[PDB]
Design a protein around this ligand. Structure first.
Ligand SMILES: */C(=C\S(C)(=O)=O)[C@H](Cc1c[nH]c2ccccc12)NC(=O)[C@H](CC(C)C)NC(=O)[C@H](Cc1c[nH]c2ccccc12)NC(=O)CN1CCOCC1
Lengths: 189, 186, 191, 199, 191, 194, 187, 212, 191, 194
């Protein structure tokens, strides 16, 4: 697949290809890879669909009981670290995104259980391609107009250049509150 | 691929399936597993189609050319020597029925090149499924009409009973005087 | 690799994907064109590995031009096709894969499809070698009507393409569809 | 520990219904076992399920999930939503990923409009407008693509739709060797779940 | 499967059962494992059918080349040695040389996978079913037996070998290589 | 290890890397000449192993210089690409050289030409192309910022993009990139290009 | 490693035939020319195995020890489902193609994987090719005993000649309303 | 090796001219090309002559006659047939008669040039059929294959070369062409590729069928 | 190597040759392949020596536990079945159960690599040298024989098996399990 | 990927790389924190895979912070190295982490200390050491220009040597190298160090 995330001024944002092909054949393009956990944090799966879905739901549980336990919202580094601590036992890499600090933190947890913090992670097969656009076209923080065009753009080139990912676009700017939601079909013009 | 052929009271009668397959999906609704090596001798190969079209071409022309080069009708056993020698040099079974100075001879030819004269024969996936019905009802010196109905029966059984075999049938009565083909036995 | 060949009342149609992606299906190219013209009434659509495609169409270019000049008649499709089967069979190794499709009037339309060893199917109707072939036989088996005008047959073959390309990751952009009649040839690009 | 069989079970959500058809024929590598096998099971209520993997895993998996829906409904006095069913499936399946079930699987249900869950062997479940699995899937999906969806060019009358299913499968027997000539076809209109032995 | 041979009071008496089981499923039952390399000498064979049959034809035409190049019929020892040197050059078959020769009226050579020993005052047995009969037959052995008496030993030893060896065949053929002229024998079956 | 080429009506420009790693773990040998000017107006950008691209590059160099010393006409660049095609493909699958190549050239009729080719003898005419592991990086840029009608120098800014991109996020590759620049009259190198 | 190449079973309204030969080849060659592969779990139920022997007697003792506790009585269906459940437990194994049969009438087959099903006629092992299709050819419901047993005898006739490994003589069992009858006679 | 033939001061190859003289010194055969068929004939005691005809089947279509040395005819006919077969293996269809005439012409060429060999001693006629039409090509020893509506090859054919035209006047039908052939030729052999592609020699009884 | 057993008019008569060849070199010649699991029943064994000997001791003490837990001597069928279920659980040996039982005065069980069949009106033979004698001995068989008469069959069949099987031993031991009391027999050798 | 550490009487200084390659072909992730300050006066420089050094580094971090929150005394750095020794070695040869480490620290008796360790639990006290493929490069410099009595800053010039060396002739590694600098009072980072 193909997942993208980066933080401009107004928040962290999340973008993705909805295609989910089992081999050369396409099982589905309706598939949703973006998942919410805590009301403010969310993650994107990349790689295998079943294991990634499992670990996301599992994360939702552990986070949920924690959130019930302290009666509050946990910091994003926590939710990263739990997967870093469980995955190391064994899958598929993932990206996390959320708000605890005045800036939204971003993370990326490898199937190796490697954890990484940073500003513009991307993953999935086509990661490299948008991943060029992310500094050639985003060396620094910008605007929501600039950003939704940016992610829609970088996803489009990760859609054209990679046969392993495509389908619909689905960008999700995150407000300090929760998040927004946007979905698109083909946009070659 | 079933291929069943059987001797009658004066003529070999060959019959065969007509459906190529790539292994999973079928890759043809029809094919020719009853090649005509000569007017009074045919081959019915089973196996890889490629190797079959090859050696049957080379065989047909070795036999037609040799017939041009000599008086005698290319008596059936020479085809068997040529084919078996070719396969021996090295994947495709064959079943060949011809009629000549001897009897209506019929042969079966294994992928390693082994030859055997046979009263009745089958090869391919359907072979088992054809050996079942074929052997049960066989009798030497059947009326050729009995060949006409039987060989279609054993073919239909070796069709319905395999995933790898199916489609329309075709049958022919290789009389020494003449082949009598029909494109769809079904 | 993705190739089609519908047949018509007074026509034949041939089509393809135009992508020649590399390993992990990254699209290294989108203008690649497997269809070729060996003759005004004879076409071949190659598929499978692209190296073997250019080498093969190249050798046909050779031996067919050689025969047409050596013997004045434009080559009949049965000749080009049986000879083609003869060509691949000499060595499996030469094409690690290739799946030729041969098409054209002979003015009865002639549609045949070789296997990479030279196994061959001389069909009376459509045949569809290609990496996306299952989707092809799947759509075209039921969509097909015996005989049609070149445009309805065009939208037909186009619906088999438009359908198949969206199920396969390796299927290309575009469509080099190529309806033809003995006196005319109509290529088009569909998106 | 896995054998391939072609249960070619397909799902298809109508505007007020869901339709689940499957060839009945069982087969070894190239030989037919039974001419007639149940490749589809009925989940206890308003939903049903199909699969096409090896038959031991089909049967034991349907058994298990049936035991779970029956236990759940008896413990909670409440017939499960379709979602808890498919979700439970992701659960059961992933719980054994290190030694996976070979049964790729399909769910069809109604929420009260056929909510659906086709998916991979390890529970990577998805909803869909339509579904196919078994060796007959890759062939039929384009036929199902166009008849209903028109992404590059009224689609669910019950008659027209059962027709699309019919022609799709009947064509599928032709191009595929594993697909069998017989078919069951279920129809989960909100009243109840019809069965058809059309072939 | 089984191939056997015991010399009666004068000549050889060879035997075999036909089955030609193929892949642990019988394919060409009632074949002819025993052979006419010539009237003077017959050559039982077992192992792979293809390699054996080709080798059989090959030694045949060497035998005829030798047969007419010198008008005397070739000694069977030479048939043995040419089969020795031939199969030496992989190819694989095991086999039994019996026959009449004015030089040595009755012998019985036995070629292994590669190299060939004799048994002038003995018997030769080979194949999967051999192993049952090596011990049984080498008990009943006595050199005085006439064909009426040794026909029994051949017949029975075949029957026991066939009883408890799955590869071993049904109908059996035997040849009574008489010291004198013609030596013919007809197919027969028991159980 | 990264190779890049870009055609337009005003230009063919072949940017490419200069490094040459003895050991894959380290770029111990530097400033290597990946290019091979094979024509008055056709350069060849080879890649992979240094020994394959050297043997093969010198080889093609000779067969073309021979062909031109022979017949009066210069080798038309598509004939050059296809000849390299036949040569690279000539090897049985057991033997082809590990050599990614960008033919680039000029024509008295067809003007500027570009041919992307592969270790396998796969080849096509394109408006831009890349080789090495870096193909994945620059290509989303080269696709993005491309003008079909662009002046050559803003393309040179596009290679500045590509390069600063490969530095930041790849096998870091900071040293200056030579790049022959086609013109109606001549090629025009820039070894200093950083 | 003893193996029994084939077993078949067939039914008609007045009862259900089920037979096999008594050979038990110990690899390349026969060991037991008189093995008993058909086995009687219940007065209205028997198991017939065609694979490796040891596993078959193992499952034999298992089904019996499983039975005596229940000896309404354990139905052939419950016996079959217990059987398949055992194979599939073992799998995650025993080499057989055991079929359960008995009584209205019930035949069920089980492949080695615990793959299993139910049909009017079941054949097992080498028979499937060399008898089943033929027995798929002439099978009819309400065959009388003469029709049925002459039919299975035609099938074992084709089989002993085509199967690589068969015995000349057939241990044979027919289940009737009166009770299961294991005919002693062999052919 | 050594091309035993070499050029004259006068420019001619004398040797091939010799072979021309041998063919001229050797036995007659006719060819006539009906609008809907082609007929070729020739003037052919212990000897059972039934085995011996100058006529020969190269394919179901093509048939030939030589004039010169019979063993030379034998080997040319052999290579020729092996070429019709080599072609029908190389492609899916029957050889065009013109193509086979070209390959025979090259085979005849080589020995006329290639070292150490005596040039072929005979002319050839090659009636045939193709999708183009019913054909008749004579092949010269030099390699000079040539189209003919009719031809002659053997002894005393100077006067005899000019009887053949009359069938084209109004006898283009085969049955009337027969008289043109035999009466021009006035033992014997006749092979005819008719409206059907296959050809077959007329028996002496059928030779008496036209003798009346 | 060889182990055999034929029931005479009443009781069993087991036999074996000792050699215990080790790695195709004889190591412990004149061992004792036959065993006393008990006086009522003796158990020939062949296969790997170690696995067999351990299994032998194990079944021994089960036999004694059963022997005293119920003062009646354990039926030999039960010795067979416990060896069945035991070796079922890799371990590997083949073996022969003979003995006397008031329930069934003379039987002869035969355990394969894993699963065990009987031969009440027959004979049991196993080992590498078995295969020679299966056919020979199954000819000489008749159920009427007394020990004076069957002692010969045992003796000879051992001698033939030992003749033409390299693993097969020299000195041989036999036991005449008489229907009545003591059944002893002494080591003996021929060739 | 390259790790370096150097002890003297006036200093322990751990220079190290900041890159972190997702794919071995490319350093897609940057500025990583390889160091782990585990003590008031003992840093741990881990390397290899990011996930092993993270799990293990956090692990050792906790066992030491636990040990110190427990007993009054801080963990003496050799006890720290040996404890890391026992932990890394605890794994059966089937399981040890792929983790190269440089313990470095200060002591109330033994003053500055340094412990070079390996993926295999091999370990020794040394005056200088290195990890990664770059060990081969800088070590001939570190050996060469070393003063046993040197002031800390000329050592910092020595790491400038090592670094400009690894840039020129290795997996090019230009980005700034963080490096904790021990003092009698505290550690002193320099992320800006290029
Ligand atoms: C018998 C099947 S079987 C399992 O019983 O032996 C048939 C015999 C057959 C099929 N067609 C003809 C024509 C004339 C004579 C005999 C014929 N053979 C098969 O089913 C093949 C299966 C092999 C593995 C046993 N099928 C094939 O070989 C494929 C045919 C094919 C593929 N694409 C096509 C397009 C049009 C027409 C036919 C085809 N092709 C391959 O298997 C590819 N191989 C791979 C290796 O060998 C050479 C090419």
């Amino acid at each position: 697949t193909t997942t993208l995330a980066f933080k401009f001024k107004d928040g962290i944002i999340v973008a993705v290809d909805s295609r989910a092909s089992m081999g050369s054949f396409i099982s589905s393009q309706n598939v949703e890879k973006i998942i919410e956990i805590n009301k403010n944090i969310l993650g994107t799966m990349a790689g295998g669909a079943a294991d990634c879905l499992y670990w996301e739901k599992y994360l939702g549980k552990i986070i949920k009981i924690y959130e019930l336990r302290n009666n509050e919202k946990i910091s994003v580094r926590a939710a990263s670290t739990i997967l870093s601590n469980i995955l190391y036992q064994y899958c598929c890499g993932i990206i996390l995104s959320g708000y605890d600090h005045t800036g939204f933190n971003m993370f990326y947890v490898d199937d190796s259980g490697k954890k990484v913090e940073g500003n513009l992670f991307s993953c999935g097969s086509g990661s490299t391609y948008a991943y060029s656009i992310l500094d050639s076209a985003y060396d620094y923080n910008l605007n929501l107009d600039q950003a939704v065009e940016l992610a829609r753009n970088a996803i489009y080139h990760a859609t054209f250049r990679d046969g392993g990912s495509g389908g619909k676009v689905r960008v999700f700017h995150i407000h300090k509150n929760g998040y927004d939601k946007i979905i698109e079909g083909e946009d070659v013009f | 691929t079933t291929i069943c052929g059987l001797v009658c009271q004066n003529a070999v009668i060959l019959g065969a399936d007509t459906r190529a397959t790539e292994g999973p999906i079928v890759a043809d609704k029809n094919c020719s597993k009853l090649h005509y090596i000569s007017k009074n001798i045919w081959c019915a190969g089973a196996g890889v189609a490629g190797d079959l079209e090859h050696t049957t071409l080379w065989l047909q022309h070795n036999v037609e050319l040799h017939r041009l080069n000599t008086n005698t009708q290319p008596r059936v056993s020479m085809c068997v020597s040529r084919l078996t020698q070719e396969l021996f040099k090295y994947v495709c079974a064959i079943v060949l029925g011809g009629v000549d100075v001897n009897g209506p001879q019929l042969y079966g030819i294994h992928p390693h090149g082994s030859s055997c004269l046979l009263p009745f024969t089958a090869l391919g996936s359907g072979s088992l499924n054809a050996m079942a019905v074929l052997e049960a009802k066989y009798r030497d010196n059947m009326t050729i009409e009995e060949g006409k109905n039987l060989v279609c029966e054993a073919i239909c059984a070796g069709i319905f009973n395999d995933l790898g075999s199916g489609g329309n049938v075709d049958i022919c009565v290789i009389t020494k005087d003449s082949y009598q083909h029909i494109r769809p036995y079904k | 690799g993705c190739v089609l060949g519908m047949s018509g009342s007074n026509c034949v149609a041939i089509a393809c994907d135009l992508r020649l992606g590399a390993n992990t299906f990254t699209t290294v190219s989108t203008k690649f064109s497997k269809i070729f013209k060996m003759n005004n009434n004879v076409y071949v659509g190659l598929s499978g590995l692209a190296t073997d495609i250019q080498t093969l169409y190249e050798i046909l270019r050779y031996r067919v031009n050689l025969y047409e000049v050596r013997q004045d008649a434009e080559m009949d499709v049965e000749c080009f096709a049986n000879m083609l089967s003869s060509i691949l069979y000499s060595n499996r190794f030469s094409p690690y894969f290739v799946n030729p499709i041969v098409v054209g009037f002979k003015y009865e339309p002639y549609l045949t499809a070789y296997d990479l060893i030279g196994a061959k199917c001389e069909t009376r109707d459509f045949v569809v070698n290609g990496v996306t072939s299952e989707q092809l036989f799947g759509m075209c088996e039921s969509l097909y009507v015996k005989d049609q005008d070149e445009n309805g047959l065009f939208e037909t073959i186009s619906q088999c393409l438009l359908s198949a390309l969206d199920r396969d990751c390796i299927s290309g952009w575009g469509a080099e569809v190529l309806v033809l009649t003995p006196e005319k040839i109509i290529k088009k690009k569909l998106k | 520990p896995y054998i391939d069989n072609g249960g070619t079970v397909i799902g298809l959500t109508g505007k007020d219904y869901v339709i689940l058809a499957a060839d009945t024929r069982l087969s070894l590598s190239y030989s037919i076992y039974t001419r007639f096998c149940p490749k589809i099971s009925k989940l206890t209520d308003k939903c049903i399920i199909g699969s096409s993997g090896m038959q031991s895993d089909i049967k034991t998996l349907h058994s298990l999930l049936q035991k779970k829906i029956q236990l759940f409904v008896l413990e909670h006095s409440h017939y499960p939503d379709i979602h808890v069913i498919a979700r439970l499936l992701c659960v059961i399946l992933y719980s054994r990923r290190f030694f996976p079930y070979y049964a790729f699987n399909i769910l069809a249900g109604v929420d009260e409009k056929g909510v659906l869950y086709n998916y991979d062997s390890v529970g990577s479940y998805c909803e869909a407008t339509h579904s196919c699995v078994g060796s007959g899937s890759q062939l039929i999906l384009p036929i199902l693509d166009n008849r209903v969806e028109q992404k590059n060019q009224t689609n669910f009358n019950l008659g027209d739709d059962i027709n699309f299913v019919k022609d799709a499968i009947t064509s599928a027997t032709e191009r595929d060797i594993y697909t069998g000539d017989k078919t069951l076809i279920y129809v989960i209109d909100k009243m109840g779940i019809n069965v058809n032995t059309l072939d | 499967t089984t191939i056997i041979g015991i010399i009666y009071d004068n000549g050889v008496m060879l035997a075999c059962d036909s089955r030609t089981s193929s892949g642990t499923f019988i394919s060409n039952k009632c074949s002819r494992k025993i052979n006419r390399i010539n009237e003077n000498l017959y050559v039982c064979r077992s192992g792979a059918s293809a390699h054996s049959q080709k080798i059989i034809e090959i030694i045949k035409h060497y035998c005829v080349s030798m047969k007419n190049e010198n008008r005397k019929k070739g000694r069977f020892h030479e048939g043995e040695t040419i089969y020795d040197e031939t199969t030496y050059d992989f190819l694989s078959c095991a086999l039994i040389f019996g026959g009449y020769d004015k030089i040595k009226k009755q012998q019985l050579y036995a070629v292994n996978l590669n190299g060939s020993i004799i048994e002038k005052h003995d018997f030769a047995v080979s194949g999967s079913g051999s192993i049952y009969i090596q011990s049984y037959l080498q008990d009943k052995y006595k050199k005085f037996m006439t064909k009426k008496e040794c026909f029994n030993l051949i017949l029975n030893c075949v029957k026991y070998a066939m009883h408890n060896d799955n590869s071993s065949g049904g109908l059996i053929r035997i040849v009574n290589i008489t010291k004198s002229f013609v030596e013919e024998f007809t197919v027969v079956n028991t159980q | 290890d990264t190779l890049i080429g870009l055609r337009g009506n005003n230009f063919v420009v072949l940017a490419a890397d200069t490094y040459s790693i003895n050991s894959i773990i380290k770029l111990k040998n530097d400033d290597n000449t990946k290019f091979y000017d094979i024509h008055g107006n056709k350069c060849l950008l080879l890649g992979g192993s240094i020994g394959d691209r050297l043997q093969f590059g010198e080889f093609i160099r000779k067969n073309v210089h021979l062909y031109q010393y022979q017949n009066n006409t210069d080798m038309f660049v598509k004939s050059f690409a296809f000849f390299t095609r036949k040569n690279l493909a000539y090897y049985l699958r057991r033997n082809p050289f590990e050599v990614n190549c960008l033919i680039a050239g000029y024509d008295k009729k067809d003007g500027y030409q570009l041919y992307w080719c592969d270790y396998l003898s796969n080849m096509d005419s394109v408006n831009k192309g890349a080789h090495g592991y870096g193909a994945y990086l620059v290509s989303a840029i080269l696709d993005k910022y491309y003008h079909e009608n662009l002046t050559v120098d803003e393309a040179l800014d596009i290679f500045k993009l590509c390069f600063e991109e490969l530095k930041k996020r790849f096998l870091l590759t900071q040293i200056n990139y030579e790049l022959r620049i086609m013109y109606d009259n001549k090629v025009e190198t820039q070894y200093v290009t950083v | 490693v003893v193996t029994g190449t084939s077993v078949i079973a067939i039914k008609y309204k007045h009862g259900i035939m089920i037979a096999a030969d008594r050979k038990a080849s110990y690899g390349s060659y026969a060991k037991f020319q008189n093995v008993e592969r058909i086995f009687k779990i219940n007065n209205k139920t028997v198991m017939g195995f065609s694979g490796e022997l040891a596993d078959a007697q193992y499952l034999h003792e298992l089904l019996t020890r499983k039975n005596i506790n229940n000896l309404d009585m354990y139905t052939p269906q419950h016996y079959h489902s217990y059987v398949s459940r055992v194979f599939y437990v073992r799998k995650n194994p025993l080499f057989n193609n055991i079929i359960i049969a008995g009584i209205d009438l019930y035949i069920g087959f089980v492949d080695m994987h615990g793959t299993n099903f139910c049909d009017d006629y079941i054949t097992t092992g080498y028979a499937r090719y060399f008898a089943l299709t033929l027995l798929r050819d002439h099978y009819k419901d309400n065959m009388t005993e003469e029709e049925a047993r002459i039919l299975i005898n035609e099938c074992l006739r084709i089989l002993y000649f085509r199967d690589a490994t068969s015995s000349n003589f057939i241990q044979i069992v027919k289940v009737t309303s009166k009770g299961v009858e294991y005919e002693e006679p062999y052919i | 090796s050594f091309s035993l033939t070499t050029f004259s001061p006068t420019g001619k190859l004398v040797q091939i001219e010799y072979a021309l003289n041998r063919v001229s010194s050797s036995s007659p055969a006719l060819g006539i090309r009906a609008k809907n068929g082609v007929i070729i004939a020739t003037e052919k005691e212990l000897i059972e002559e039934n085995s011996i005809f100058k006529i020969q089947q190269i394919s179901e279509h093509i048939g030939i006659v030589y004039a010169g040395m019979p063993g030379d005819f034998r080997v040319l006919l052999k290579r020729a047939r092996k070429e019709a077969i080599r072609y029908s293996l190389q492609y899916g269809s029957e050889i065009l008669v013109k193509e086979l005439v070209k390959i025979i012409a090259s085979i005849v060429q080589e020995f006329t040039q290639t070292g150490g060999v005596r040039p072929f001693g005979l002319s050839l006629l090659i009636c045939g059929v193709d999708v183009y039409g019913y054909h008749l090509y004579q092949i010269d020893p030099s390699g000079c294959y040539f189209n003919w509506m009719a031809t002659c090859v053997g002894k005393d054919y100077q006067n005899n070369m000019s009887f053949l035209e009359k069938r084209y006047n109004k006898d283009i039908e085969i049955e009337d062409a027969i008289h043109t052939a035999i009466l021009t030729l006035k033992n014997i052999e006749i092979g005819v590729a008719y409206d059907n592609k296959p050809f077959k020699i007329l028996t002496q009884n059928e030779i008496k069928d036209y003798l009346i």
